[PDB]
Design a protein around this ligand. Sequence first.
Ligand SMILES: O=C(O)c1ccc(Nc2c(-c3ccccc3O)nc3cnccn23)cc1C(=O)O
Length: 438
Amino acid sequence: NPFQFYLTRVSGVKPKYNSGALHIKDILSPLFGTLVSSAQFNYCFDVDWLVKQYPPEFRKKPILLVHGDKREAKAHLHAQAKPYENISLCQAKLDIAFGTHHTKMMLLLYEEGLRVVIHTSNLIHADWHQKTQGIWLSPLYPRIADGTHKSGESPTHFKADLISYLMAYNAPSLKEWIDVIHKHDLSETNVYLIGSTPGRFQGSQKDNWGHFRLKKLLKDHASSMPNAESWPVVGQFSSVGSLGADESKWLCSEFKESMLTLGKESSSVPLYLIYPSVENVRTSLEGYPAGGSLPYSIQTAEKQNWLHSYFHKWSAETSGRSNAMPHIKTYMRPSPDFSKIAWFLVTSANLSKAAWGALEKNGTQLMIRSYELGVLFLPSAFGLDSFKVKQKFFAGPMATFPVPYDLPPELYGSKDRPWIWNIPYVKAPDTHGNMWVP
Ligand SMILES: O=C(O)c1ccc(Nc2c(-c3ccccc3O)nc3cnccn23)cc1C(=O)O
């Protein structure tokens, strides 16, 4: 495979389903590089746990935690890290109300080079235990020789785009990492970066972030095919924001419109949304506590019952993970028979205006509340016109893309309900014998 797309290890599935999966201990192993320092971008951290995931010989190397916590949450994180003198912290500014620093990324500086890891897991035990999570591993980027002047840039512009993402923080600890990235050769990168940063973007900047960034890349680097209107859009996520009183407000007017873009020329496109039902969660490896990581509140849900007619169950027989609840987020464009895909995106961004952006100011300004980061796989970046879908995720013409859940997605049954995390479920017990009482 050229894609370097991995799932995290799941405790409790047969070895066959973990063969090519990665635990965080695998990612940080000396086999991947001799660690000099690291930056851990994330939402939630268990610092004691995190340090134990580094190899013993690397546990005193400098670590930067990039987070968005404020006030007492910020104080708690500093208290977690204070026992570790090698750990520094960077508070990402969140100057727009109700924003989150969701981005999950590792910058790993080695003696041998630099690696970038963009993934979907929080840095806590439960996120790497029994969940379906996604990982993209960059190649080992070599250092550019002192005195040599070359861009180190890839055909996908990844090096400049990653620096641009980091520059948006306006943070001194991250300017240090920008300077590290400048000194390395990222030309082998074959994915496109898709980030969200908080702000209000107009004019040139409109295309830099969020769903307008995705749209711009699909216009510039994908081709429209005949019968493109029959190629569905699939979105798959672990949390749902307030989308409005009907699908015209945002979901099918600007979000779907960006997602269905192909090529440079000017909808009945089917939209499948994958989100765990109550039954998915109940029968999961974790049981109802998996629902603590599927934050969809009843206050949000009751305002948009129309949305749930788009919901499809989580099913992942292809990767042995139907009972490993998803915290990965993915978006993709399959063919009408789901045998090919026009592109695939793995990201931290959930189905929310905060993550993807919402147009303001009579369509002239894209407002984003949160930090998000993902990578986009485009056939053109691999010399292909489409990706064939890999039949079994861990099975074995390595130019087939490993989609980690089953296609076609299966619609909710009439008795199914979306997982809503702050109401009780006391009618049937979970895999550990318990009910759910918030
Ligand atoms: O991706 C995801 O599914 C995800 C979703 C939400 C999230 N944070 C969060 C929480 C929250 C509070 C306490 C325990 C868990 C929680 O989720 N409450 C809110 C309210 N509004 C915005 C964000 N909120 C973080 C992530 C993530 O994993 O980064």
